[PDB]
Amino acid sequence: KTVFHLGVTEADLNGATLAIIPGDPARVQKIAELMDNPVFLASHREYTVYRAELDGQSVVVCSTGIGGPSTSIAVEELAQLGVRTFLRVGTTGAIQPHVNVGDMIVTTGSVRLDGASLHFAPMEFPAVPDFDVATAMKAAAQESGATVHMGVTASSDTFYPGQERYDTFTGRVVRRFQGSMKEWQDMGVLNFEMESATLLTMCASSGLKAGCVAGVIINRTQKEIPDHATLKETEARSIKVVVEAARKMLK
Amino acid sequence: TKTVFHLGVTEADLNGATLAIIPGDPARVQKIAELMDNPVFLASHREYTVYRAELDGQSVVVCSTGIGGPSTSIAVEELAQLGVRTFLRVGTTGAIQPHVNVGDMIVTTGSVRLDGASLHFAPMEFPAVPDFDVATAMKAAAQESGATVHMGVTASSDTFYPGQERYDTFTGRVVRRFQGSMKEWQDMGVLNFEMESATLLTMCASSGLKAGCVAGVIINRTQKEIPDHATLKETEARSIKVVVEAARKMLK
Amino acid sequence: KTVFHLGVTEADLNGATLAIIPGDPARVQKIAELMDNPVFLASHREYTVYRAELDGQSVVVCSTGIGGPSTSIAVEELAQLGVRTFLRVGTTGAIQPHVNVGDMIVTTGSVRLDGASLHFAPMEFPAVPDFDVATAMKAAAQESGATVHMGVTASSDTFYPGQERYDTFTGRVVRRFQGSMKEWQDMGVLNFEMESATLLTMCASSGLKAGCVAGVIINRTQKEIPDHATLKETEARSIKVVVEAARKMLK
Amino acid sequence: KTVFHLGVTEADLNGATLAIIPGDPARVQKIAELMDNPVFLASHREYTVYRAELDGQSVVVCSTGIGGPSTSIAVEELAQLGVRTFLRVGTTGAIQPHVNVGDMIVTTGSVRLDGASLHFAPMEFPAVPDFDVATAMKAAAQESGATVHMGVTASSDTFYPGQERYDTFTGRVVRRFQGSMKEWQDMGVLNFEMESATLLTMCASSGLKAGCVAGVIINRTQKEPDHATLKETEARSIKVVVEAARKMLK
Amino acid sequence: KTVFHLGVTEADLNGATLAIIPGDPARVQKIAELMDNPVFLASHREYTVYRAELDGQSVVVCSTGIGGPSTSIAVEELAQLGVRTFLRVGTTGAIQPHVNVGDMIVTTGSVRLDGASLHFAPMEFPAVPDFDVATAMKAAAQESGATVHMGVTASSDTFYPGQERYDTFTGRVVRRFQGSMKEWQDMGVLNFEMESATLLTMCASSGLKAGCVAGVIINRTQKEIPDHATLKETEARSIKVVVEAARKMLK
Amino acid sequence: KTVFHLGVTEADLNGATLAIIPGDPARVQKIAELMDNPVFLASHREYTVYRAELDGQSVVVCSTGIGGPSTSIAVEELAQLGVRTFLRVGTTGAIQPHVNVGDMIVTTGSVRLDGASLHFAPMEFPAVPDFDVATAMKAAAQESGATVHMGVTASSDTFYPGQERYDTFTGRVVRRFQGSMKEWQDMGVLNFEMESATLLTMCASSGLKAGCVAGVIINRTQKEIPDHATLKETEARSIKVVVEAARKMLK
Ligand SMILES: O=c1cc[nH]c(=O)[nH]1
Ligand SMILES: O=c1cc[nH]c(=O)[nH]1
Ligand SMILES: O=c1cc[nH]c(=O)[nH]1
Ligand SMILES: O=c1cc[nH]c(=O)[nH]1
Ligand code: NA
Ligand code: NA
Numbered sequence A, C, E, F: 001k002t003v004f005h006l007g008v009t010e011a012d013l014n015g016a017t018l019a020i021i022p023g024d025p026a027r028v029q030k031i032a033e034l035m036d037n038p039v040f041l042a043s044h045r046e047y048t049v050y051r052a053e054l055d056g057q058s059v060v061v062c063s064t065g066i067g068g069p070s071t072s073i074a075v076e077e078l079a080q081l082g083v084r085t086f087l088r089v090g091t092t093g094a095i096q097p098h099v100n101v102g103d104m105i106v107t108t109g110s111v112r113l114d115g116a117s118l119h120f121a122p123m124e125f126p127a128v129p130d131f132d133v134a135t136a137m138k139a140a141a142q143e144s145g146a147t148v149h150m151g152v153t154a155s156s157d158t159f160y161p162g163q164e165r166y167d168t169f170t171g172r173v174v175r176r177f178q179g180s181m182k183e184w185q186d187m188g189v190l191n192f193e194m195e196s197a198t199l200l201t202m203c204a205s206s207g208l209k210a211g212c213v214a215g216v217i218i219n220r221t222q223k224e225i226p227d228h229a230t231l232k233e234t235e236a237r238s239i240k241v242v243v244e245a246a247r248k249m250l251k
Numbered sequence B: 001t002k003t004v005f006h007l008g009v010t011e012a013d014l015n016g017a018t019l020a021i022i023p024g025d026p027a028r029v030q031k032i033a034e035l036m037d038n039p040v041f042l043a044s045h046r047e048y049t050v051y052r053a054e055l056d057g058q059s060v061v062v063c064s065t066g067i068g069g070p071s072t073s074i075a076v077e078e079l080a081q082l083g084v085r086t087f088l089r090v091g092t093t094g095a096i097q098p099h100v101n102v103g104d105m106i107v108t109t110g111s112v113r114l115d116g117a118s119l120h121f122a123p124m125e126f127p128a129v130p131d132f133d134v135a136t137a138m139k140a141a142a143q144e145s146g147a148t149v150h151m152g153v154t155a156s157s158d159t160f161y162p163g164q165e166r167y168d169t170f171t172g173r174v175v176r177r178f179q180g181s182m183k184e185w186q187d188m189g190v191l192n193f194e195m196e197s198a199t200l201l202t203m204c205a206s207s208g209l210k211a212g213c214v215a216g217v218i219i220n221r222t223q224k225e226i227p228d229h230a231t232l233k234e235t236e237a238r239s240i241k242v243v244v245e246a247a248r249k250m251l252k
Numbered sequence D: 001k002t003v004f005h006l007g008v009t010e011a012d013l014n015g016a017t018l019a020i021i022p023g024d025p026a027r028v029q030k031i032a033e034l035m036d037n038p039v040f041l042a043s044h045r046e047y048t049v050y051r052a053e054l055d056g057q058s059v060v061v062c063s064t065g066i067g068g069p070s071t072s073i074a075v076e077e078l079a080q081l082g083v084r085t086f087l088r089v090g091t092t093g094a095i096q097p098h099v100n101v102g103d104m105i106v107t108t109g110s111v112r113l114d115g116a117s118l119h120f121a122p123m124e125f126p127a128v129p130d131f132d133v134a135t136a137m138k139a140a141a142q143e144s145g146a147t148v149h150m151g152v153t154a155s156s157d158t159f160y161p162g163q164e165r166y167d168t169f170t171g172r173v174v175r176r177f178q179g180s181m182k183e184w185q186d187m188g189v190l191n192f193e194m195e196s197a198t199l200l201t202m203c204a205s206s207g208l209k210a211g212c213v214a215g216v217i218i219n220r221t222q223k224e225p226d227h228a229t230l231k232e233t234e235a236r237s238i239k240v241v242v243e244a245a246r247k248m249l250k
């Protein structure tokens, strides 16, 4: 039985019950190669799927693409194939001045500025990670030597107006999002990304274990542009951390 | 001058194109571009494969959107930044009316907004409606191809599974909001389900951009939940011919 | 057999399945006399009902009164008597600089600033015209020689605060509607009226065909006042257009 | 100087600050003639306007048409012309078994199943009448000898699905309103009508005094009423609102 | 045979079908001792319950604590034991400039800025008092010599941000409540308190009679924190009125 | 200055930056006595305030009363006097069959079925605890010997309809909450209580650290009635745990 979007079978996964789920298809092989015996499984649309072994145990790496809609498909189809634990790694924009490029964020809860979360739970439901996964991510991120922040993530269905960017084609932001960045800042929100609300809400309400770790690639309050070196390091550290968090989740 | 954040192309790269064809699947991009003159690969980052081509002597961009409103909104915004004003979406859809067949075409006249990204451009009250010229061109292109064509309302969902009231899933549960929702839409005359039209049409209708949506029916939900891969290739060839002809009509 | 409000029977309509639905009871006779053998049927409250013949086929002309509630009654009761196609004609106020007095607007979709549309479909449902009816109206309007605008209409339950008028008794507009005209303007919305969201949503969700065409008789952005001869020419043009749209809908 | 829809001026109203606002333009003359010196002022669309004298003081009678949108126009324009008090009269259909044809309902509050109300205040604002107007209406209703019910009215933007009628073209009722009648019944709601939520919210949030009184002519729960009872109820309703107005004036 | 939170039995109430429900448990004894044969029944949490006699009939006096949640528990459990009439007395802040400290406000309707009302009826439902109770409270207040105002009350789940207080730890008010006080003021709203929306909605939708009378302890056009010097006298007046209101409801 | 409701000053607190906040006023002394030099500070309405010392540092114990509104006042006024960390302890009813009487729950996130949370942040914002507090609570709970569950809690503005109880005066539950217990159960929610949504949302959005730990007194899915010895043992255990959680937070 092949799942419709991902194009893999349960046999393909080789008993894996844990998935690492990056956003970018290009990141899948890189993560897989940090582990043992990486094996390319399939590539369809934004979904690149690999299998590898961590401490003897089969693990899946599967990209989600951008946004909760495409993430929700990947998570659902992997769950059909037996995956029960989902470790999200992705890039993020910080919105607090104390948070620097190269820092790591582990989401304790997400502002649900998406639509897909609502297809699993009403708005009142918290977009919260599994406590064990969040604990493992904090441990792995801190043990890596990175500066780590635990806190609330604003998770948006857009990269532009939902993150109150005005340097756009229309230069307009709809009423709902006018003044919204200052509002999140004052509420102590750490960062913007585009998948965590969907991921955390669907998993918390569906008996699946999930968490999110993110490397800070930009800070919206900072005028300085990060150099190539810092970005490469950040990207390398992010995937190292997610693999080590996965190691901590294995039993 | 500037390279857009995700698409990784410049305005110079597009060679003066003001119209884009925006399929969902990156693999479908080259297939669209080769139906036109002088296709050139521009960039491929994440779910975004960008080609340029020439249609009747005018530069046309072809760019994948990936799945869903959020991914789609990035592509449209960045293409608009580089001078694109008209967007023709082509994709696959599931029919919820029993009379619509696999292989039929649907041109969306309005979208039920079961997405979140549309709200990042306009309040829920705003209609998720296409540019009338694009919708007219798509209908005509679809008819002239020999296809059975349906004009009507499309339900546009941020999920493939529960928001389209699919029950063959890991939990087998559908949240309260969406229980009975397919039969609701059906009784209301809604033709089909897909995942990008509400975001695309709302975003464009509220931003001074022209947009439309044509889709190939790959499944009828009165039979089953998961689409057969057979007849999927056949449906996809017709769909892309229709959209290139629709683009031709738009360029005058 | 006799509908509750309209005071007509199925027999009274002589097999008509198309209705032209103006707002003002006073306009019904004027529209009906553009066609052949106009016959007065009933008059109760804001509902004046005529019958006429167009290219040999029976046509109904029925006023709706102001607002979606009154309109919803008329459309429902006509539908009970076999009417399937509804052509809304009126005069409207433009909010775009480029739209002049004497231009025609054909609605491609309505902003649902009403309440009655929610009695037929949740807010997510598009207040969209039937495509054939929209097509017939565009053709009739363009063939008349008028400049025709295809676009979005804001459809409000009030004439005053919902259209952000401050020239009022209180001079206040509720928070929801503060800054709303400029918001609609920036979004490309063409005009305000008060019935289309109800008509379009109810029909699009009930297996009925509907559309709206309106003549522009004032512009909220222009200080200059239109002269009498233009206003009456626009009103005359509006009703000729809708009758020709009806002709295009007969088969 | 002359309001946009009503086609009357402030001079036309002769200093009137109170208005009686029936729904049906045909009822306007019938209310006006209960007072002194009734004079037709204007008729445009569903707005028929008369002026009259009650105890030496000028009073305006103006039809609203059906629904909150048309009502909101009438009330606003009358307000521009100095009207500060609005008395709504009608006949209605009850949803409670204990409420009989011939009884009067005085609305103490409205379920806001409309849209125009939200153009004046957010949903959390109560669609509530002015206490003096409601008090005067109760007294006048009791003084007429009828059984009077004080309570909540469900105010709907539609006559059909918003009142959970299934005897319709589609025979469907949107999810929001499925089971709603039983819901309102169990919560003690007295009746359905179509204008009060808009009228009451608009006036309560704009410094205007308003209230609603209505004769019961049909009951959704009771299988039935005599023609003589119906015209008597209609006659009583407008007698009551005029006497309610007299109380308001002094 | 005791209710879960209140710790009273039906026998404890000695036939009472009317309750006076102040907020503060300290006002319970005071109110009871304005009547005959006051008897302490129970005290648990914020719920102090007394019995007394008014013109030979049993009345219950029971504190609600602060807010709709704790109020809802008290009303429900008293209803279970046979109470059908609930007279709320409390403190309030005026938002209109003409309303002075020491004045009495009888609520004709409540702005539902609470959450507990939604546990009884959808937002569309009016938070309206029983007419007889409101009439009795007006009469009691006017007959006592006090200055009385009848009108709309804004009923908030918070004392601070929901009543637009800025003299707080953060100094910040969430978007929803920014500018809200002036909005209520412009709309003719008289006062702020914290229980009436819950109480009135619950009772109006549950076949129970309820009303609210409140003594003005602060005018918000002046300041945010109530002066201590005037509380005692204002509270003395309030409880005098509610007891007289109760006398008028006895049948 | 002395805060309005609590009746205490900053000097009263003796430098305390951490508060333990039970619901019941009667629990305040019982918690304080587990620490050194407990001293009664004030008692007004439902707010009983004590000060104590834990490993040489000042700690405050303050009752909240029932529900978010009362809680919001206590948290805000303590925050004005320098309190930055809030540890909630209480009772709860489990809705999962696997959760036994005598077990403890540490809330990782709350379903916002309250009103007061909205006065601090829109519904999209997660009702989430501070991660260090939840970590400290889990550790303290485990080291006490009890079985601990980490998970989502449904936080309701009512005890009755919002927790889908039908054994009530009216015997009915508003549409919104019909079928809601089963919904939460299928979504993996552990329990119902009445304060966590407000507490966690206000603190997470206001730069305050907060968490919630609770003893399971009763299971909605079990028929077996828990022994008196069990219920008292769990009450005692809950407060020992929160004091230990406090110790972990201080150093
Ligand atoms: O600013 C950013 C950076 C990465 N991802 C986002 O969603 N936003
Ligand atoms: O059923 C379907 C088929 C294609 N695309 C969808 O979104 N749904
Ligand atoms: O301002 C005030 C005074 C008393 N009670 C309130 O809720 N607010
Ligand atoms: O079931 C319960 C038990 C304690 N507290 C609650 O709120 N609910
Ligand atoms: Na995508
Ligand atoms: Na009308």
Ligand code: NA
Pocket (backbone or CB within 6 Å): E046, E064, E065, E066, E067, E070, F046, F064, F065, F066, F067, F070
């Ligand atoms: Na309380």
